[PDB]
Design a protein that fits this description.
Chain C: It is found in: Virion; Host nucleus. This is part of a larger assembly, with three copies of chain A. By secondary structure, chain A is an alpha+beta fold. The first copy, chain A, has one helix and two strands. In chain A, strands 1-2 form a two-stranded antiparallel ribbon. In chain A, a hairpin with a 2-residue loop joins β1 and β2. Chains in contact: A-B, B-C. Chains B and C meet through loops of B and loops of C.
């Protein structure tokens, strides 16, 4: 599964706190990506692995 | 790391091809099935003429 | 450069071009005149970055747009004003195909 969401809000929360991000909000939903390649993301200066 | 979007407009190039809208392939598959349904149904199949 | 208010802010956190369409310097074509001009001006295709829309503003990414009118003339050293506009490096049609 690739990294997907239902809003920009959950994406910009996923970069905020990786260990405490809410995978399921009220109606929206976000999927953290598991993959053989652990691709790195840059949204300004906050980064996750 | 570009935040792309996937709305229905990108889906429109697949959800509007008539191959997705024809039942001829799935009915050709189901009629050519070696073991069809065990039970059938009779009520409200078609419209009967008064 | 003047823009609509509906250009998303998620466009601007990346290092994108100040006009709409990201001018692919060689990823259009090497030595052609209708693919570079195609992938710079003609909005019939979306740009290489964001395939879900053609431009992020139609007041600068078009050929006859405001961002081409008030900025892109041919740069001359002997211009009588002679001031430097920093956004002229993104709009010069000669410089956009100088690479």
């Amino acid at each position: 599964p690739a990294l997907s969401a239902s809003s920009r809000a959950l994406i910009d929360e996923f970069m905020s706190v990786k260990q405490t991000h809410a995978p399921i909000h009220y109606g929206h939903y976000i999927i953290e990506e598991v993959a053989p390649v652990r691709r790195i993301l840059k949204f300004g200066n906050k980064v996750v692995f | 790391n570009l935040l792309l979007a996937f709305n229905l407009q990108n889906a429109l190039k697949v959800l509007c091809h008539p191959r997705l809208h024809t039942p001829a392939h799935t009915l050709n598959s189901l009629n050519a099935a070696p073991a069809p349904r065990d039970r059938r149904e009779t009520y409200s199949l078609q419209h009967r003429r008064p | 450069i003047v823009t609509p208010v509906t250009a998303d802010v998620a466009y601007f956190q990346k290092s994108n071009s100040p006009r709409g369409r990201a001018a692919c310097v060689v990823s259009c074509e090497n030595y052609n005149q209708e693919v570079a001009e195609g992938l710079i001006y003609d909005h019939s295709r979306p740009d290489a970055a964001y395939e879900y829309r053609s431009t992020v503003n139609p007041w600068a990414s078009q050929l006859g747009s405001l961002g081409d009118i008030m900025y892109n003339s041919s740069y001359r050293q002997t211009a009588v004003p002679g001031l430097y506009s920093p956004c002229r490096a993104f709009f010069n049609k000669e410089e956009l195909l100088r690479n």
